[PDB]
């Protein structure tokens, strides 16, 4: 029933993914995008400095899937990371690791294009991972790499998934990840940001993530989160800490879009409620002491 040898080719792999998808309540595509992200994360985890410390830490929506699992988290198109070295070192090293492969998987990485963010001197970079399995093309994953800010690469947590084990690829998955205080600081800053005149802030989906993150924090001291929020808000030097959590006019339907699939969780069902929940979280963080 569980597979004793790895899949011999892509068809047998897709076929096993679909049997696992139905076997436990997921759409085939969500599970496939998740396997592709696990594979990309394993390529990123082979990038070590001369002490063995990771060079890339996963963040954003990919981190949250790993933390909570597929059923209890938002679908994440992006695979975002924070590097502790320059991209040119990062991009060459991924192509290397992508060529060596991992348990049948191989990857090709398009060229990094700088993107524009006005609060960071070092600009973020986006490119794409074209995955293959035993030679045959498998999936395409957007990647976002950005620079360290304050101490957000100082520590990491190491998350695992057993998705690939279900389809008979037994090797352990262990992905270094940005810690929650810094995920909270970054999403808080992005969700309360006011942008330049061409564009508007569409990030109502971050109000879901911030409610998930507050649960994962549980009853821990918030002093590390407060320190991290102070640090991100000062370094970027856009709007000040503590921010006001403003709802924009198109956000009701975007927010409702970000809740798809999460009926079982205890989350605010409307955007106004979500904003309030996030504002009380902000007030909690700001009051933290010793
Ligand atoms: Mg085939
Ligand atoms: Mg299926
Ligand atoms: Mg199966
Ligand atoms: Mg460097
Ligand atoms: Mg590219
Ligand atoms: Mg710091
Ligand atoms: Mg650590
Ligand atoms: Mg963010
Ligand atoms: Mg505290
Ligand atoms: Mg602290
Ligand atoms: Mg105001
Ligand atoms: Mg909905
Ligand atoms: Mg609704
Ligand atoms: Mg609170």
Numbering used by the authors: 3 to 292
What does the article say, verbatim?
We found that while Rv1045 encodes the guanylyltransferase TglT (unusual type guanylyltransferase-like toxin), which arrests bacterial growth, Rv1044 encodes the atypical protein kinase TakA (unusual type of atypical kinase antitoxin), which neutralizes the activity of TglT via phosphorylation. It encompasses an N-terminal domain (NTD) and a C-terminal domain (CTD). The NTD (1-181aa) exhibits an α/β fold that commonly found in nucleotidyltransferase-like proteins. A large central cavity is formed between NTD and CTD.
